[PDB]
Structures are given as structure tokens and as C-alpha cells.
Structure 1
């Protein structure tokens, strides 16, 4: 659905990964994050409402999702390999991307 709901599922599932005991829990959480990130692709954030869909800001905004999506992808492979700690570490590294976009556009 909307940007806020997608952001909520990203946040909820990042916390799930942080507290996870097994690979299945991490895999499920990352799958849901992948779907939320993909669904958020086309959203226009409130702070960029006055800007063109083709503006440098909107391109940069969408670029952040490219980065997040790529990171979720790789973290899911690590989880699929049963590498819980490695996948959790990869999910922690996702935060740098979360935080970078929030700093600019939230």
C-alpha cells in the first residue's frame, strides 16, 4: 500500500531479524522487506511533493530503494545458506541505507 505502511513493515521486520533465533525467521522477514521495498518504489514522499517525478531529488529518492533492494537480496541469500549471524549482520548494514534516505527526505 502506501509509503508509511511499507515503512512500517520494513521496520517491524528489521526488528524481527535482530531478535531471530533461526534462519527461517530471518528468511521470512527479509522476504516481507523485499516486497515492501519493491512496493515503495513509485511513492512520492511528503517532502518531495512539490518536485517533478523527473527531478534530481526523485531520481535520488528512487536510487535509495535500488540500494536497499540489492542489500535485501544479498542478505536473503545468506539467510538461505543458513548463515544466521551473517544475515543479521547484513540486515544491520541495511540501516546505513535506511538512515541515509531518512536524513535527506524524511
Structure 2
């Protein structure tokens, strides 16, 4: 799907996690955030249409998602142990990874 649709699925499910009641709701939100981030992996962003797939910048771009996928998995792991407090706070801490890619490429 589109990068915007993935960025919407990321932004939406983050607020789902913030306002959730339990680990199942958190989990399925993280599972959807994960699938969306791995789907936006291939996208060329508007601000780098003048760079090739194997350029330094597109490696750095794709690496920003590698970081995000990893953190989602750490959070998701916390949800699967029934640690909802901690998972919710881990999800919160993604914000600076989201932010860091935007400060460079959004």
C-alpha cells in the first residue's frame, strides 16, 4: 500500500495503544504497526525521489525502519508477557524514532 496509508496506520495504532484497556488491544495494534512499517520499507519518499534505491540516503532511510521494527518488537514482547504498562510506555518512546526520520526525510 501507499506510504501515507502506512504512516496513517502507524499514527492511528499508536493512539490505540495509548488509550487501550489491555495487552490484547496493545498487541494487535503493535502487530499492525509492525506489518505497516515492514510494508513502508520499500517506499521511496518524496524528499528522496532524486536518490537511487542503493544510495547512502535510501540505506539510511530503510535503516530508520529497521530501528522502528525492532522497537515495536520489544514493545510487542512486553505485551505478550502481560506487561501492558511497560508496553504502553515503550510505544510512547517510539515517538523519537518517528521524529528522527521526519527531521531528515519528511
TM class by shorter-chain length? over 0.9
The 4+ residue runs of structure 1 with deviation greater than 2 A are none
Q: Distance in 1 between matches of 2:25 and 2:98?
A: 21
The CA RMSD over aligned residues, in Å, is 0.6
Give 1:9 deviation, angstroms.
0.2
Give 1:54 deviation, angstroms.
1.3
TM-score normalized with structure 2 length: 0.98
In the alignment, structure 1 segments of 5+ residues that lack a partner are: none
In the alignment, structure 2 segments of 5+ residues that lack a partner are: none
Give 1:59 deviation, angstroms.
0.6
Give 1:52 deviation, angstroms.
1.2
TM-score normalized with structure 1 length: 0.98
Give 1:15 deviation, angstroms.
0.5
Q: Distance in 2 between matches of 1:79 and 1:95?
A: 18
